[PDB]
Amino acid sequence: DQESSGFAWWAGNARLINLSGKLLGAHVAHAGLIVFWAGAMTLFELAHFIPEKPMYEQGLILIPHIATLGWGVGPGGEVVDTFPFFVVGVVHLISSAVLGFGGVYHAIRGPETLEEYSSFFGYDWKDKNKMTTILGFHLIVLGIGALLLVAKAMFFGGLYDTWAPGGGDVRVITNPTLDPRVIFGYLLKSPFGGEGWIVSVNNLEDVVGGHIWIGLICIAGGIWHILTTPFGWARRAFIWSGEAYLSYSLGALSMMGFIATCFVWFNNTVYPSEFYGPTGPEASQAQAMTFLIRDQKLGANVGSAQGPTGLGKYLMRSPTGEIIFGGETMRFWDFRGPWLEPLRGPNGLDLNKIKNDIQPWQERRAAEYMTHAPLGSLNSVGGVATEINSVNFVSPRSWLATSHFVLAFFFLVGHLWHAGRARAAAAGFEKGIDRESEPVLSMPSL
Amino acid sequence: MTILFQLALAALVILSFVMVIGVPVAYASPQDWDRSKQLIFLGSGLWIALVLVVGVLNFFVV
Amino acid sequence: KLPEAYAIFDPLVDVLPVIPVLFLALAFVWQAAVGFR
Amino acid sequence: VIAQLTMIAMIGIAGPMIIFLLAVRRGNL
Amino acid sequence: METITYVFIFACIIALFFFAIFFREPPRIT
Amino acid sequence: SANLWERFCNWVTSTDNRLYVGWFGVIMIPTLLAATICFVIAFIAAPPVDIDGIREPVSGSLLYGNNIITGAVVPSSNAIGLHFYPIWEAASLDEWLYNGGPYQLIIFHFLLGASCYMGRQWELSYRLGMRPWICVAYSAPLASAFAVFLIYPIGQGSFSDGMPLGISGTFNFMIVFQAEHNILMHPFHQLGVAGVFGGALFCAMHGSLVTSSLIRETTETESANYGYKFGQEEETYNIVAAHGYFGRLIFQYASFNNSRSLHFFLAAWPVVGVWFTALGISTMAFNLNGFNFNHSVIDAKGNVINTWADIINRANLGMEVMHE
Amino acid sequence: TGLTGNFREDTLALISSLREAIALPENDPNKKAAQAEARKKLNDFFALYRRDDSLRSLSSFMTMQTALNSLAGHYSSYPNRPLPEKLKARLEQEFKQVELALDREAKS
Amino acid sequence: WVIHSITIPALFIAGWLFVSTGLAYDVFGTPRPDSYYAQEQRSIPLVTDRFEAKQQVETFLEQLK
Amino acid sequence: METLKITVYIVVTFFVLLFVFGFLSGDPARNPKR
Amino acid sequence: MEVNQLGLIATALFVLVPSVFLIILYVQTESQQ
Numbered sequence A: 001d002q003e004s005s006g007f008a009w010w011a012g013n014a015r016l017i018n019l020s021g022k023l024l025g026a027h028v029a030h031a032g033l034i035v036f037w038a039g040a041m042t043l044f045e046l047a048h049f050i051p052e053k054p055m056y057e058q059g060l061i062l063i064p065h066i067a068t069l070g071w072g073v074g075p076g077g078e079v080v081d082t083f084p085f086f087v088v089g090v091v092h093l094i095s096s097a098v099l100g101f102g103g104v105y106h107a108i109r110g111p112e113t114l115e116e117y118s119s120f121f122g123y124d125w126k127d128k129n130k131m132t133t134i135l136g137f138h139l140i141v142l143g144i145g146a147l148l149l150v151a152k153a154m155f156f157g158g159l160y161d162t163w164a165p166g167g168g169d170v171r172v173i174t175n176p177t178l179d180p181r182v183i184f185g186y187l188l189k190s191p192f193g194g195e196g197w198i199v200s201v202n203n204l205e206d207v208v209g210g211h212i213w214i215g216l217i218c219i220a221g222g223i224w225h226i227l228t229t230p231f232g233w234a235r236r237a238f239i240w241s242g243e244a245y246l247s248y249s250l251g252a253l254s255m256m257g258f259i260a261t262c263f264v265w266f267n268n269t270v271y272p273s274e275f276y277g278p279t280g281p282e283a284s285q286a287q288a289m290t291f292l293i294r295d296q297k298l299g300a301n302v303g304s305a306q307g308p309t310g311l312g313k314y315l316m317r318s319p320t321g322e323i324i325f326g327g328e329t330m331r332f333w334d335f336r337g338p339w340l341e342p343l344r345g346p347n348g349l350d351l352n353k354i355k356n357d358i359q360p361w362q363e364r365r366a367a368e369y370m371t372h373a374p375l376g377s378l379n380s381v382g383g384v385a386t387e388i389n390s391v392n393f394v395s396p397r398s399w400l401a402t403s404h405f406v407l408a409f410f411f412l413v414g415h416l417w418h419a420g421r422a423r424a425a426a427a428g429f430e431k432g433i434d435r436e437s438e439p440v441l442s443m444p445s446l
Numbered sequence B: 001m002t003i004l005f006q007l008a009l010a011a012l013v014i015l016s017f018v019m020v021i022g023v024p025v026a027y028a029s030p031q032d033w034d035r036s037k038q039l040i041f042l043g044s045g046l047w048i049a050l051v052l053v054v055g056v057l058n059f060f061v062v
Numbered sequence C: 001k002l003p004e005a006y007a008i009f010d011p012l013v014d015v016l017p018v019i020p021v022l023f024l025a026l027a028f029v030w031q032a033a034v035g036f037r
Numbered sequence D: 001v002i003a004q005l006t007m008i009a010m011i012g013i014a015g016p017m018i019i020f021l022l023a024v025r026r027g028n029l
Numbered sequence E: 001m002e003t004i005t006y007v008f009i010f011a012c013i014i015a016l017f018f019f020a021i022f023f024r025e026p027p028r029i030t
Numbered sequence F: 001s002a003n004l005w006e007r008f009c010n011w012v013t014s015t016d017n018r019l020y021v022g023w024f025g026v027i028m029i030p031t032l033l034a035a036t037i038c039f040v041i042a043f044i045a046a047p048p049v050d051i052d053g054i055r056e057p058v059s060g061s062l063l064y065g066n067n068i069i070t071g072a073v074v075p076s077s078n079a080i081g082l083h084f085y086p087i088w089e090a091a092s093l094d095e096w097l098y099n100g101g102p103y104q105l106i107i108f109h110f111l112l113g114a115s116c117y118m119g120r121q122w123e124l125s126y127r128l129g130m131r132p133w134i135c136v137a138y139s140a141p142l143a144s145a146f147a148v149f150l151i152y153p154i155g156q157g158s159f160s161d162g163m164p165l166g167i168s169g170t171f172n173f174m175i176v177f178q179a180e181h182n183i184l185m186h187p188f189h190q191l192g193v194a195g196v197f198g199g200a201l202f203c204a205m206h207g208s209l210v211t212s213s214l215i216r217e218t219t220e221t222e223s224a225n226y227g228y229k230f231g232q233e234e235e236t237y238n239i240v241a242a243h244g245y246f247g248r249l250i251f252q253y254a255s256f257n258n259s260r261s262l263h264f265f266l267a268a269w270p271v272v273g274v275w276f277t278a279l280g281i282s283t284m285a286f287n288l289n290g291f292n293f294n295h296s297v298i299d300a301k302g303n304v305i306n307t308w309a310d311i312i313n314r315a316n317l318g319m320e321v322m323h324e
Numbered sequence G: 001t002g003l004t005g006n007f008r009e010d011t012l013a014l015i016s017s018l019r020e021a022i023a024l025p026e027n028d029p030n031k032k033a034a035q036a037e038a039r040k041k042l043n044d045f046f047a048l049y050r051r052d053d054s055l056r057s058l059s060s061f062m063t064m065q066t067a068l069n070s071l072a073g074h075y076s077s078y079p080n081r082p083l084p085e086k087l088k089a090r091l092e093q094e095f096k097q098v099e100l101a102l103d104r105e106a107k108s
Numbered sequence H: 001w002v003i004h005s006i007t008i009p010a011l012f013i014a015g016w017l018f019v020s021t022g023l024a025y026d027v028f029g030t031p032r033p034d035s036y037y038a039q040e041q042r043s044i045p046l047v048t049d050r051f052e053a054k055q056q057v058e059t060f061l062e063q064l065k
Numbered sequence I: 001m002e003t004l005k006i007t008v009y010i011v012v013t014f015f016v017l018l019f020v021f022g023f024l025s026g027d028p029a030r031n032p033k034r
Numbered sequence J: 001m002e003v004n005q006l007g008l009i010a011t012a013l014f015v016l017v018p019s020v021f022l023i024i025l026y027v028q029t030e031s032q033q
C-alpha cells in the first residue's frame, strides 16, 4: 500500500494504475454510491413532497425526471399516483446494496490482479487490443439502453409530451422520424442565436427517432471494435496508456456537461416547462404577456402605440415579418413555448386573435409563470432580483444548469490536467527534468 | 396488519445495518476471513429473502 | 407524501442523502488510523 | 425532529466503528 | 490633435514590443 | 529535402524560431492578428453603434471625443439578439457596423484565439522536455474570459449584456452587473478576492524573503543584481537564513521548508481563487444569485431594524431602476 | 386517425370528424367514448404535423393549430362538461376559413 | 488533562448566562428586542451634538415606553 | 459580401484542415526523448 | 471637443524628458569600454 512503492497519500488513488483487481473494486463501489445517491434523493424528496402544488414549487430536482418518462404524471401534469415514484428510488438502493458489496469484494478478498484468475478479464493498459475489446462491450451495452429508452417511447406506456393539442402531456409515439436529412443535418445547424445546435429539438419524435440511430450506431461500434483493431494513424497518435484513457474520458465528459448545461437552461421540449418550471426566456416572455392582457382587457388598445422609451408599449414589428413583445423581452423573440405559439399568427402575434383565443389554462398558466422567473439566492431569498423578501424560491431549472456547469468546468481542467501527465509520463520526463542532461542545456541558443 | 409488517420491515435494516458492519470486517483481518466466516453465505442468502417480504407484502398491505 | 405503511421512519428518510458525503470523510479517518503511510 | 439526530448519530458514528474495530484488532488496514 | 496623440503614444508601445522581443541581447550561459 | 510537406511540418514544429509557433499557432497567430487589426481600427473608428434600435446610438469610438478611458467597442445590439451575425449575413456594410458587428467579430476570433494559445503554451512545453502544467495555470484567466465574454450573455440571451470591452465599458459592466445579481455578497466572488489578494500577498513575501537573503557577489557601489550570473549553479539565496526568518517571525512550524512545496502552493492559491469567480459568474448568468440577507432582523412591532445588507439591497435596487 | 398522404387531404379528412363530433346527443349510448376516441386522433394527428417546418410558416396550417389547441385543450381540464356553444360555434367558422384558405395555398 | 474538565465548563456557563441574564444589555447598552421606539413615534433616536450625548442618550433612552 | 462568405469558409477550412493532421501524423514522435 | 489648451505639452515633456533621460544613460553604457 504504502508510499515506498507508489507516491504520496493525498493522491494515493493512482497507486491503483497497475492493479486491476483493485480497480474494479473502485468503480463498482463508486457506481454503488451514484446509484445509492439516486434512490436516496428520490425517497428524500418523496417524503417532503406535496402532490397537489406544482413540482418546481417544491424545489425538486429528480422526481421531474422520473415523471418526464410518464409515470404517475397524468394529464394536466396531475402527478396522479406517487407509488411509481417510490418504486424507482427504492430499487436503486437495493441495487446499490449489491454493488458496493461487490465493490468491497474486489476491494479486499478479490484477487489483487486479474491477469491470472481470468485471462479474458485480464488487460494491460498498454495493450491496444484486449482493451479495445472492452471498449466494444460497453459501447454495445450503452447502446442497448438508448434503445431501451425507445422501448419506453414506442411500447411501454408513453413518454411525456411538451406539445399536445391541449394539455401538453402524455403521448405514445407511433412513427419516429428517422433519416439523415433531418438528423445528421440536424446537428449541422448553427449553435448561436435563433437556431439551437442540439437544443432546438422542436418535436419530441426527433429524440426517439434520433436515439434509434444512436442505438443502432453504437451497436455497430462494438461490432466494429470487437472485430477490428486500431489502424496506423490511430497508433501514431493518442498515447495509449493508463492515464490518457482517463484523460480522454474527461474531455468528452466535460463537453457533455456544457451541453447538459444548455438543455436544462433553454430547451422546453425535453424538460417540460410545466413541472420543471418555466425557462428563463419563457419567464420574462410570459410575464410580458400577462401585463399585455390585463391592460388590453380594460379600456385600452395597445396594438398601435408608443412607449416612453419609444419602441411601443408592448408589441413591436421585428426586422423579420413576425411581430413580437417589447421591453427587455424583445431580446427573446425566438422563444416558442407550448402556450405561446398557438397565440402566434402567421407572422408574429395576431392581436385580434390574442384577445379571443386565450384559454382557461393558458392565461392562468402564463400568469403562473409570472411569479416564477428564474432568480433567487443561496439561502433562497426570491422574487425579482431586488424585490424585497417576497416569493422566495430558486427554480430547479436554474440549479442544474448552474451545478452541472461548475462540474463541467472542472472536467475541462481535469482533462487538461491528466492529458499533461499522461503524455509526459509516456514521454518519461514526467518525473521532473533530468539533472544529468537538461534537454534545453544543449540546444541552439537564439 | 402493516404493523406486523413494519416490524419485519425494520428487521431488514437492523439485520442489514449489522451486515453493513460485518461484511467489511469479515474481510478486514484475512486470518480466518473466508476460513472462519461462512456467515455471509448464511446471512446473505437469508438477507435477500428479507427484501422480498417488503414489496410483495406491501403491494397487498398498502 | 411518504406511504402510510412506511409512514414513520423519520430520521432515516429525513437524512439518507447526507451519508454519501460521509464516505469522503471516512476516507480521511481511514487515512488517520493508517496515518499517511 | 426529536430523533433526527438520534438515528443520525447511530449511523454517523457507525462509520468510525469500522475504523475503530479494525485498528483495535489490528487488521489489514 | 486630441486623438492623434493617443495613437502616437500607443504606436511607440508596439514599436517597443516588436523591438524588445527580437532585439534583446541573448543572456548566454556561464 | 525529401518533400515539401515533411520539410514544412518540420519547420512549424521547429524550436529554432524566435517565436515558437506550434500547430495551435496555426490557428492562434492568424486569428489574434486578425482580432487586433479589426480591434484597434474598430476601437479608433466605430460608427455610433446602437445598443437598442429604438434610438440611442452610442459612440464608444476613439475618433468621437473619447479619451482612452471613455472609449470602448460597443457590444452588439439587442435587436440582433444572440444571432450569429457575420459580415455577409448582414444586409449592408454600414448595417453590419451600426448593429454592433465588430464586437461579435472580435470576441469570437479572440476567444478561439485565446483557447489555442492555452494549448500553444502546452505544445511548446512538451517539446522542450519539461513537465507541462502551465496550461493548467493559464486556464484561470481563460475561464474568466469565456465566463464574462461568451457565457454570461447566453444567460441573458444577448451579447448586448456581454462585457463592452474598454476601460469605461468594463466599469459600466460591473456596476450594472452588481445591480442585478448582487455579486458582492456571493460567496464565490468572496473567495476570488482572497484568491487575488493572497496571490498579490504571497507575491510580496516570496518576492521579499528571497530578495532579503542574497549571497553577496557584489560590491556595495555596484548594483546588487548584476552579481547573479545567468546559469549560476550556486544557490543565489540562502534558505537556511530566510527559513528561520519567517520561522522566527511567526512560529517555526509553518515556514514551508521545501521550495518545491512552497512554489506549488504559491501557484495554487491565486489560480483556484480565480476559478471560483469564473464559476461565480456562470452561477450568476443563470440567475442563481448571491444570497442577500434581507429583513434578517425584525422587532416584535413589525418595524424593520434595517441591517446593513438592506443598504446594499437598496443601492442595487437603486441602480436597476436607473439602467431601465 | 388513419392519416396518410399529404397534409391537405388528411387535414380536410379530420375536419369531417371534428365538425361532426362537436354537437351530438349527450344521452346517446356513448357520446363521451365516441368523443373520446375521436379526439384521441388529434393526439395522433397534431403530433406528426408539429414536425413539419414548412407548414409551420403559412397560415392555413397554423390556423388548424389554433383550432386544435382551442378544442382539445378543454379536455384535459374538465372534459366531462360539453363545450360552451360560443366555443363550439366559433370553431366551424375557423374550419370554414381553413379549407378555403387551405385551398388558397395550393392554387395561390 | 487535570483542571481542563473544570475551567472550561464553569467559565463557558458564565457567557451563557450574561445573555440569558441579559446582563450584557445594560453593560453594553444594546437595545432590547422590544426597545427601539418608545410610544409609537417611529423615528431614529439619533444622538446629535457633543458635550450633550451623555445627557442626550438619556432622552431617547429615558422614554423607553 | 457573398464572395467574402465563401472566402472565410475556404480560409478557415484550410487552417483547421492543416491543423488536425499535425497531430494525426506522428505528433508524439516529436519530442526530446521517447 | 474642448480641452485643456496646454494639456498637450504635459504629455510631451512627461514622455520625452523621462524617456530621453533613460536613453542618454543607456547610450553611455553602450560606449563603455
Ligand code: CLA
Pocket (backbone or CB within 6 Å): A010, A011, A012, A013, A014, A015, A246, A250, A410, A411, A412, A413, A414, A415, A417, A421
Ligand atoms: C473522472 C474523474 C477522475 C478520476 C477517476 C481521476 C483519477 C485520478 N486523479 Mg484526477 N482529476 C479530475 C478527475 C478525475 N481524476 C479532475 C476533474 C481534476 C481537476 C479538478 C483532477 C485533478 C487531479 C489532480 C490535481 C490530481 C489528480 C490525481 C488523480 C489520481 C489519484 C486520485 C487522487 O488524487 O485522489 C485524491 C483525493 C483527494 C485529494 C481527496 C479529495 C479532496 C478534495 C479537496 C475534495 C474537495 C471537493 C469538495 C466538493 C469541496 C469541499 C466540500 C465543500 C462542502 C466545502 C487518479 C488517477 C492525482 C495525480 O497525480 O494523478 C496521477 C493528482 O495530483 N487529479
Ligand code: CLA
Pocket (backbone or CB within 6 Å): A001, A002, A008, A009, A010, A011, A012, A013, A015, A016, A022, A023, A025, A026, A027, A029, A030, A097, A098, A100, A101, A104, A107, A108, B019, B020, B021, B023, B024, B028, C023, C024, C027, C028, C030, C031, D018, D022, D028, D029
Ligand atoms: C470514494 C471513492 C473511493 C474508492 C472506491 C476507493 C477505493 C480504494 N482506495 Mg481510496 N481514496 C479515496 C476514495 C476512494 N478510494 C479518496 C477520496 C482518497 C483521498 C482521501 C483516497 C486515498 C487512498 C489511498 C491513499 C489509498 C487508497 C487505496 C484504495 C484501495 C484499497 C483501500 C483499502 O485497502 O481498503 C481497505 C479498507 C478497510 C480496511 C476498511 C474500509 C471501511 C469499509 C470498507 C466500510 C464499508 C463501506 C460500507 C459501510 C459497507 C458497504 C457494504 C455493505 C453493503 C455490506 C481501494 C480500491 C489504497 C490503494 O492504493 O489501493 C491498494 C491506498 O493506498 N485510497
Ligand code: CLA
Pocket (backbone or CB within 6 Å): A135, A139, A217, A218, A220, A221, A222, A224, A228, A229, A230, A231, A234
Ligand atoms: C465513445 C465510443 C467510442 C470510442 C471511445 C471510440 C474510439 C475509437 N474509435 Mg470508434 N466508433 C464508435 C465509437 C467509439 N469509438 C462508433 C459508435 C462507431 C460507429 C460504428 C465507430 C467507428 C469507428 C471507425 C470506423 C474507426 C473507429 C476508430 C476508433 C479509434 C481511433 C479513432 C477515433 O477515436 O477518432 C478520433 C476522431 C478523429 C480522428 C477525427 C474527429 C472528427 C470528428 C467526428 C469531428 C466531427 C465534427 C464535429 C461535430 C465538430 C465539432 C467541433 C467540436 C469542438 C465539438 C478510437 C480508439 C478507428 C480505429 O482505430 O478503428 C480501427 C476507426 O477506423 N471508430
Ligand code: CLA
Pocket (backbone or CB within 6 Å): A238, A239, A244, A247, A248, A250, A251, A252, A253, A254, A255, A412, A415, A416, A419, A420, A422, A423, F027, F112, F115, F116, F118, F119, F122, I016, I023
Ligand atoms: C479547451 C481547450 C483545450 C486545450 C487547450 C486542450 C489541450 C490538449 N488536448 Mg484537448 N480537448 C478539449 C479541449 C482542450 N484540450 C476538448 C473540449 C475535447 C473534446 C473531447 C478535447 C479532446 C482531446 C483529445 C481527444 C486529445 C486532446 C489532447 C490534448 C493535448 C494536445 C493535443 C491536441 O491537439 O489537443 C486536441 C485539440 C483539440 C481537440 C482542439 C479543441 C480545442 C482547441 C483549443 C480549439 C481549436 C479549434 C477548434 C477546432 C474550433 C475552431 C474551428 C471551429 C469553428 C469548427 C493538450 C493537453 C490529446 C492528448 O493529450 O491526448 C493524450 C488528445 O489526444 N484533446
Ligand SMILES: CC1=C(/C=C/C(C)=C/C=C/C(C)=C/C=C/C=C(C)/C=C/C=C(C)/C=C/C2=C(C)CCCC2(C)C)C(C)(C)CCC1
Pocket (backbone or CB within 6 Å): A029, A030, A032, A033, A036, A090, A093, A094, A096, A097, A098, A099, A100, A103, A104, A107, B012, B013, B016, B020, B054, C006, C009, C012, C023, C026, C027, C030
Ligand atoms: C471500500 C472502501 C471505500 C469505499 C466505500 C464505498 C464506496 C461504499 C459503498 C457503499 C454503498 C454503495 C452502499 C450501498 C448499500 C446499500 C444498503 C446498505 C442499503 C440499505 C437500505 C435499504 C436496504 C433500504 C431499506 C428500506 C426499504 C427497503 C424501504 C423503505 C425503508 C428503507 C429505506 C429503510 C472507502 C473509499 C470509503 C475506503 C476504503 C475502502
Ligand SMILES: CC1=C(/C=C/C(C)=C/C=C/C(C)=C/C=C/C=C(C)/C=C/C=C(C)/C=C/C2=C(C)CCCC2(C)C)C(C)(C)CCC1
Pocket (backbone or CB within 6 Å): A183, A184, A186, A187, A198, A201, A206, A207, A208, A209, A210, A211, A213, A214, I020, I021, I023, I024
Ligand atoms: C441529432 C440529435 C440526436 C442524436 C444524436 C447524435 C446524432 C449526435 C451525434 C453527435 C456526435 C457523434 C458528435 C461528434 C462530435 C465530434 C467530436 C467532438 C468528437 C471527438 C473527437 C475529436 C474532436 C477528435 C479529436 C482530435 C482532433 C480534433 C484533432 C486531431 C487529434 C484528435 C483526433 C484527438 C438526439 C437524438 C440526441 C436528439 C435530437 C438531435
Ligand SMILES: CC1=C(/C=C/C(C)=C/C=C/C(C)=C/C=C/C=C(C)/C=C/C=C(C)/C=C/C2=C(C)CCCC2(C)C)C(C)(C)CCC1
Pocket (backbone or CB within 6 Å): A087, A090, A091, A094, A095, A096, A098, A099, B051, B052, B054, B055, B056
Ligand atoms: C416491488 C418492490 C420491491 C422489490 C423489488 C425487487 C425485486 C428488487 C429487484 C432488484 C434487482 C433486480 C436487483 C438485482 C440485483 C442486480 C444487480 C445489482 C446486478 C448487478 C451486477 C453486475 C452488473 C455484475 C457485473 C458483471 C459481472 C460480474 C460479469 C459479467 C458482466 C457484468 C457487468 C454483468 C422493493 C423491495 C424495492 C420495495 C418496493 C416495491
Ligand SMILES: CC1=C(/C=C/C(C)=C/C=C/C(C)=C/C=C/C=C(C)/C=C/C=C(C)/C=C/C2=C(C)CCCC2(C)C)C(C)(C)CCC1
Pocket (backbone or CB within 6 Å): B013, B016, B017, B020, C012, C019, C022, C023, C025, C026, C028, C029, C032, D010, D011, D012, D013, D014, D015, D016
Ligand atoms: C444508517 C443506515 C445505513 C448505513 C449508513 C452508513 C454505513 C453510513 C456510513 C457513514 C460514514 C462513512 C461516516 C463516516 C464518518 C465520518 C465522520 C465521523 C466525520 C467526521 C470528520 C472527521 C473526524 C474529519 C477529520 C478531520 C478534521 C476534523 C480536521 C482536520 C482534517 C481531518 C480530515 C483529519 C444504511 C445505508 C444501511 C441505510 C439505513 C440506515
Ligand SMILES: CCCCCCCCCCCCO[C@@H]1O[C@H](CO)[C@@H](O[C@H]2O[C@H](CO)[C@@H](O)[C@H](O)[C@H]2O)[C@H](O)[C@H]1O
Pocket (backbone or CB within 6 Å): E001, E002, E003, E004, E007, E011, F040, F063, J001
Ligand atoms: C498600428 C496602429 C495603426 C493606427 C492607424 C491610424 C493612424 C492614423 C493616425 C492619424 C489619425 C488621427 O485622426 C485624426 O485625429 C485628429 C486629432 O486632431 C482629428 O481631428 C480633430 O480636430 C479636427 C480639427 O478641426 C476636427 O476637424 C476633427 O473633427 C477632430 O476630431 C481628425 O478628425 C482625425 O482624422
Ligand SMILES: CCCCCCCCCCCCO[C@@H]1O[C@H](CO)[C@@H](O[C@H]2O[C@H](CO)[C@@H](O)[C@H](O)[C@H]2O)[C@H](O)[C@H]1O
Pocket (backbone or CB within 6 Å): E001, E002, E004, E005, E008, J001, J002, J003, J005, J012
Ligand atoms: C507627441 C507628438 C506630438 C504629435 C502632435 C500632433 C499634433 C498635430 C496637430 C494637427 C492639427 C491640430 O491642431 C489643433 O487642432 C485642434 C483640433 O484638432 C484645434 O483646436 C480647436 O478645436 C478644438 C476642438 O476639439 C478645441 O478643443 C480647441 O480648444 C480649439 O483650439 C487647434 O486650434 C489646433 O491647434
Ligand SMILES: [Ca+2]
Pocket (backbone or CB within 6 Å): none
Ligand atoms: Ca425538514
Ligand SMILES: [Cl-]
Pocket (backbone or CB within 6 Å): G078, G080, G081
Ligand atoms: Cl365540469
Ligand SMILES: [Fe+2]
Pocket (backbone or CB within 6 Å): F206, F207, F210
Ligand atoms: Fe519568486
